[PDB]
Amino acid sequence: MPLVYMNIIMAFAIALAGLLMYRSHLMSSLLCLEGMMLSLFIMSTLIILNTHFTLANMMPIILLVFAACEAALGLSLLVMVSNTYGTDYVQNLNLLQC
Amino acid sequence: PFFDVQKRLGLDLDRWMTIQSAEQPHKIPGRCHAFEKEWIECAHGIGGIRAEKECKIEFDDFVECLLRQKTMKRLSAIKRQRDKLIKEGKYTPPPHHLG
Amino acid sequence: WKPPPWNDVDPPKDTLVSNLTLNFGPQHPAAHGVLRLVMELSGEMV
Amino acid sequence: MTMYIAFILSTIFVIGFVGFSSKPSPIYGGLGLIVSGGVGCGIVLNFGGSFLGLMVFLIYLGGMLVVFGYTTAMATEMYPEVWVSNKTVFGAFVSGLMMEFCMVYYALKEEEVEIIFKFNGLGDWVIYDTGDSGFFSEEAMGIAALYSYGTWLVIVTGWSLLIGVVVIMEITRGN
Amino acid sequence: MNPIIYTTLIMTVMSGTMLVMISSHWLLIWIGFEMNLLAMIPVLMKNFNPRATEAATKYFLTQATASMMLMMAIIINLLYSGQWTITKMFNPVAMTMMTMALAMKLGLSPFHFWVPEVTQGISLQAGLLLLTWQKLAPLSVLCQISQSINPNLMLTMAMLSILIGGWGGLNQTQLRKIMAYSSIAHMGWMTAVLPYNTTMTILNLLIYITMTLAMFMLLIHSSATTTLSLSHTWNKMPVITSLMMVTLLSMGGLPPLSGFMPKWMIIQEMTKNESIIMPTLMAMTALLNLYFYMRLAYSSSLTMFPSTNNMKMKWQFEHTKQMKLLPTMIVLSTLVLPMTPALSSLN
Amino acid sequence: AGRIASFLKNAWAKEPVLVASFAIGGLAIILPSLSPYTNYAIRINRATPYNYPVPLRDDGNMPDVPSHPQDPQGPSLEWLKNL
Amino acid sequence: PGIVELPTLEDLKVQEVKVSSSVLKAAAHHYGAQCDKPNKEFMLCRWEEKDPRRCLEEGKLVNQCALDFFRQIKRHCAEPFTEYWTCIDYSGLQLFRHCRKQQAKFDECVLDKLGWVRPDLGELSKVTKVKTDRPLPENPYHSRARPEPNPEAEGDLKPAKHGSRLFFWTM
Amino acid sequence: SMMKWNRERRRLQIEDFEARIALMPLFQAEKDRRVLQMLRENLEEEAIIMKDVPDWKVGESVFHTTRWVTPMMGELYGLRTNEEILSATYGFIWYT
Amino acid sequence: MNIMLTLLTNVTLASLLVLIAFWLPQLNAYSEKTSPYECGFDPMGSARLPFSMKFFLVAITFLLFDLEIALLLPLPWASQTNNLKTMLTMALFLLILLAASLAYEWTQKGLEWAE
Amino acid sequence: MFMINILSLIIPILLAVAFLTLVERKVLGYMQLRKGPNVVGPYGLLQPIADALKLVTKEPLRPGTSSISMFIIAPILGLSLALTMWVPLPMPYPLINMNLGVLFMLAMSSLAVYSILWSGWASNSKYALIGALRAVAQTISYEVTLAIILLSVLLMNGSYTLSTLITTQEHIWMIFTSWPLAMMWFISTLAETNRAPFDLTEGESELVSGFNVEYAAGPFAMFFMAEYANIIMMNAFTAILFLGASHDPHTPELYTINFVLKTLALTITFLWIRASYPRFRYDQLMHLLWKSFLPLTLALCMWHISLPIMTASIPPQS
C-alpha cells in the first residue's frame, strides 16, 4: 500500500471535511462534492489497473456516468435556490426551521 | 442478493465482473488469478461462517497478492539495511547491479 | 419562531432582478459613433 | 528528481484538492479542481491507464466548465472572494497546506505510517507487475467489453441518463 | 408535472430500489441508490412551493454525501478483498464507514436532522413515499451485510434514534414533523434487532410500512397538516379521526393492536442473546412516542374541538379521491396479532 | 398512401434535416440484420489470433487436431483470401 | 513460510541466441513451421507445470533448435536473408507489406535450397498437439486439501412438532 | 474502396500476429531465465547483505503456497540501478 | 520524459513572452488609463452582479450529452469483438436514448432560449 | 536531439502564424478588391514583424478592476495549449507518437476555452463577461458535434492513433467515404476557433472585444497568436483526417510537401469564408448545432457503427 494510496485517501478525507463545513456557498459546496469523485475515480483506476482486473476497468467509467448526473442535479437545484433567493450562501433557506 | 432474481430467472446481470477469475475479455488473466481461484474453490458452499476459519491461509495468500503488504515490507527491510551497511562502508554492491 | 404558512407557500421575497444596463456607445463602431444607446434588457432580451 | 513522479503528481493533486475544499469563490474553486483534475489524469497515465487518464480529462473539463459557467451566471458575488480575501478562507486554505505537508513529512521520514490503514514509503514503482500485454492494451479492451460483457450496465446507465435529462428539465421548469 | 412523466419518474424510483434488492454487485447497488436519489428529487418539488426547493435540496446533499461515502467504503473493500459481491466487508474501516453511509439514507443517529424538515417542506403525497419506500433499499443492504456488522456501533445507532425520535416528537405541532420523529423512533426499533435476527426487522418494516401508509392516507383524506387543522375534522369526518385513534394507538405499540407485534417480537429475540438492559430501555423510551400520539388522539376526536361555520357546505360535499387499500391497510395496521407466527413466512 | 405521402412531402419541405436524419438512422438498424456479411465480420474477428493457440497434449484419438501447423486438418481460412 | 528453490545459475547459462528483432521478424513464418516441435513442447510445459523453474530444459531445446534454423540459413541463403531483414528493419513498424520483393527472393531461396515452404495464412495460428512424455502435474496450483462439505441436507419432512411452538399458539 | 482496403489490412494483421506467435516461445523461454537469473542474483546479495541480522532466513516465501507466484517487479529490480528501474517500470508508458 | 519536456518548454516560452511583454515596454500610467472600458461614457456599475443568461437548460444538458459521448467513446475497440450482434444492439441502444433524450428535450420547450 | 526537435517545431509554428496575419489581410484585401499590406517590405513580407515588434513595445497595462493573477495566466493558457496541441500531429512521423493522439487533441482543445473566459472574468468588464459567456456555451455545444464527428470518422481507423490515418486513407481519400461528416466537421472547426461565420466570441460589431477585452501589447499578442495557431492546425487536423496523401517511407519530404499544401489550401478557405458571410446571431449558431447538426450527427454515427459490420470491413485494431 504505497504512498500514492495515502495521498488520494487522505485527499478524499479533505473532500469529506470540505463538504461537511459549508461556509458561505452552495456552489463551492458542490465543488467539494465533485471533488470526492476525483479521489474515488483515481483510486478505483489505480486498483483495477494494478490488479489487471480488465473486466472491471469499466467501473471508473460507470462512476463518471453517474458522476456528472449528480453534478447536473446539484446545479439544477442551485439554479432555483439562487434564482428565487438571490444568492447561493447556504443560510437563507432556514424557513423550514418551523 | 436480497431477492435473488438472477438465480431464479436463470440469467446473468452482474455475475460476470464480481470476481477477477471470471471470463475476462480475450482471456486476459488478472494478477492474482490463481490465488483467488484456490480461495473460491476452497470455500464454495461451505458457508461464510466456516469459510472465515478454514479457508484462512488461502485468503491470506490472496489478500497478500492483492497488496504485497508483507512482500513489500520484506523489500523495504532489504533496502534500508543495505543502505546503512553501504553508507557505513562494510560492503559495496556487486558489479552485476551497476551495469 | 413564527407559524408556518397555511398554504405551505411563503410570500415571495424581495425582487432579485438587476437587469444589467450598459451604454452601447458612442465608441462602438456599429453604433454609428455618436449613439449613447442605453437599453434595458431582461438579461439578454432587451 | 524523476525517482517516481507518482508522489509528486499526487502531491499537487492534494494541494489542488486543498484549494477548492477551503471554500474560495466558486470560480477560483474551479481552478483548484482543474489543476487536481489535470494532474490526476497524469497519475493514471503514469500507471498505464492511458485511455482513462485522458477520459477524466475530457469529461471533467467539460463538467467543471459548466460549473463555473454557472457561478458567473447566477451564483456570482458582487465582490468576489479570493485565496487571501476573508480570514475564514485564508484560515481554511493554510490549514489544508500545513496539514498535507505534515502528513508527507510524517510519510517520507520513517516509511511506516499507520494512520487508519498502513502506509509504508518504499516507492509506488514497486507494485508494478512483470509481464507483456500482447498486441492490445489491457485497459482499452477492458472498457471495450462494456458493449459485449456489460449489456446490463449499458441499459441502467443509458436509462438513468435519459431520466437525467427528464429530471433536469422537470426540476428547472417550475410553475 | 405532466402525469405521464410523473409515472415514469415513479417507476424509476421503484426500479432504483428494486435494483438494490436484486443485484449482487456492489457497483450496481450504488447505482440503484444513485438512480433512486436522481428520480426522487423532482418528486419532492412537484408542486414548486418555495419550501420544497430547499426541502428537496436538503435531501440531495444529505444523500449524495451518503452515496459518496458508500462508494468510498465499497472501494476500500475492493482494495483489501478484490471482491464486489455483497457477502461481508473484509476491512473493519470499510464496514465502519458504510454504517453511517447507509445511516444517513435511513436517518437514524445525529445523521437525522434532515428527516424532519424535508418531510415538512414537501407535500403530504411525497412525504408518504419518502418515509416508507425510501427505507427498503438501505435496509435491504443492511440485511445482506448483517453478518459483518460491528454490534457496538449498530446498537448505538438505533439507541440514539429511539431517544431522539421520541424526545423530538414531544415538541412538534405540524403533523408531518411528528411523523418524521415517530418514523425515526421506529428506525431504531428495526435497526436494533438487525445484528441478531434479520427476519425480525423485515417484520417490523412490514408493520411500520402499513402504519405509515395507513396514517398518511388518513391525513390525505383529512386534508390536514397541523394539529389544529386536524381538530376540525371531527365536525366533518368523524369516522376518519375515530379510525385515526386506533392507528395512533397501534403506532405507539399499545397492544393488542398490530403495532405491538414488532415491539413484542423484537424484545423476545434480543433476550435470547442475553441483551436485557437495552431492551428494557426502548421499552421505556417508546412511551414518549406514545405521548404525542395520545395528544394527537386527544386533539382529534377524543375531545371534540371548536369548529368553523364554513363547514356547512363542507359537509355538503364528499371526497372524490379514492384511496384504496385504506380499508385494507387499517386491518393489517390494527388487528393481525392472532396471526403472529406468520413471521416465519419471511424466515 | 395519401396520408403518408402528404406527411413525407410536407416534412421534406419544412424540416429536411430531420427527415434526413431519421432516414439514415432508420437504415442504420435494419440493413445490418439483412446483409449477409455480418457472419463474415464475426468470423474475421474470431479468426484473429491475439493470444497463443496453446498446444493441447496429444493422448491419441484427436484426429481433427493437427500435429503440425502445416497439416491439412484444422480450421482453414482460405475464404479470407478469396473474400 | 518456507523456501524458494531458485535453480542453479549454471542452469541459467544456456546459449543465448543473438539476432535483432527484425531478423526474427523476417524469419517468422519459416521459423514457425520448421521449429514448431520444440516450441510447442516447451510452452506445453509452461502451461501445464505453470512453473518455468520446472521447464528450463525444454527452453534449452528451443534455443538449440533456433540455432540450427539460423545456422542453416547462413549456410544457404545468408545474402537474400540479409537483404530481407535489412529491408524490414528500416521501417519503424516492421511491416511485411513494404518488402514483398525481398521476401519473394527469400522464400524461393529457402524453397529450392533448404526445402522450406512459407506457411499459408492462419496456418501458424492453428492449435497443435504434442506427445510430451512428462507426466501431467496432478496439482499444478499446489492446491491444499479441499474443505469437507457441510452435512448434506436430506431426510423426509413431517408436520412441525406441536405447531408453531411460539407462545400461546397451539397450532 | 474502404471495404476492400480494410479487408486487406485485416489479412495483413493476421500475418503480423502469426509472425508474433512464431517467436513467442523464444521470448518466453529467455525471459523466464532472465527473471530467475535476476531473482537468484537478488537472493545471493540478500544473503550477503544480511548475515549479522537477528533472523532473516534467506528467501522465505511470504505466500504459504508452494507454487510459483508471478514475481513482483519490485523484488526483481529492487537493488538494481536507478536507470534500470525507470526503463523497466515507466519504460513502455514513457516511450512516446 | 518526452511529453513533460514539451509541456515545460511551452509554458516557459509563454511565460517568457509575458515577462518581456510587461517589462520591455516601460509604463507611464495613471488612474484614468486603468479605468474599465465601456465604449466611452462612465459605466453604471456592473460586470460582477448576477448576469443571468438563458441557455442554462441546454448548458447543463451538454454536460449530460458529454457523458453520452464518454460512454460511446470506446466504440473503435468495441468492434473488435466476437459478438458484434450484441455490440451492435447495445451501441445503437445508447445512440437511440441519446436521440430520444434530445427529442424529448426538444419537444418540451428545451433548446428554446428563455426570454 | 529532442530540444532541437522541439525548437524545430516551436519556431516554425510561431513563424507560420506570424505570416498568416500577412496572408490574411493580403488575401482579405484582394477578395474585397483591396491590395493588403505591400508597403512594409516587398509585398508586405515585413508587415507582421512591424506589427509584432510594436505589440511588444507599446505600454501594457492591467485593468484597474482586474484580477492580476487570472489576467496574466490566461495568455499562458492560450499559447501553451496551442503549441502543445501540434505535438502529436503525424507529419510523416509524429513528434510524439501518442497511442491516443485523437483523444489528446480533443481534451486540450476543450481546454483552450478556459483562457477566453478567465480573461473575460478577470477583466471585470461588462463587454468582457458578455463575450466570455457567449463563447463558453458556443464552444461546448459545438464540442458535442466535434466529439461524435471524430468518432464516426475514426470507426474506419480502428484506433485513435494519428499515425494510422496515413495507412487508412492510403488508396482512397477519407472524405469520399465520410463527406457528410466532413461538412459538419469543417463548420465545427470554424466554430471552435471562432472564425467569422461565428466570430461572435470577438463580436466586434456588437461586443467591440471579447477575445481580448482590455488585453494589451503582450497579452493581446498571445490571445491572437494562440488562435491563429489553432487556425493553421484545425485545418492541418482536417487535412490529416480527411485528405490523406501518399507517404513513401524512404522519402518523407514528399508527404510533408503534400501535407503542407493541404493545410495551406484549407487555411485559405478559412480566410475565404471569413469574408463571404454575415455574422451568426447567438441563438442561430446554437440552434444550428443543437437542432440541425446534432440530429444528422447521431444519425450518421449509427450509420458508421453499422457500416463496417454490414460490409464485413472491421478495420484492424493494431
Ligand SMILES: COC1=C(OC)C(=O)C(C/C=C(\C)CC/C=C(\C)CC/C=C(/C)CC/C=C(/C)CC/C=C(\C)CC/C=C(\C)CC/C=C(\C)CC/C=C(\C)CC/C=C(\C)CCC=C(C)C)=C(C)C1=O
Ligand atoms: C471578429 O473576428 C476577429 C478575428 O478573427 C475571427 C481576428 O482574427 C482578429 C485579428 C485582426 C486582424 C487579423 C487584423 C489585422 C491585425 C493584425 C495583423 C494584428 C497582428 C498581431 C500580432 C500579434 C502580430 C503577429 C506577427 C508576428 C510577426 C509574430 C512573430 C513572432 C515572434 C516575434 C515570436 C516568435 C517566437 C519566438 C522567438 C520563440 C523563441 C524561443 C526560444 C528562444 C526558446 C524558448 C524555450 C526554451 C529556451 C526552452 C528551454 C528552457 C528551459 C528548460 C528552462 C528551464 C527553467 C527552469 C527554472 C527549470 C480580430 C481583431 C477579430 O475581431
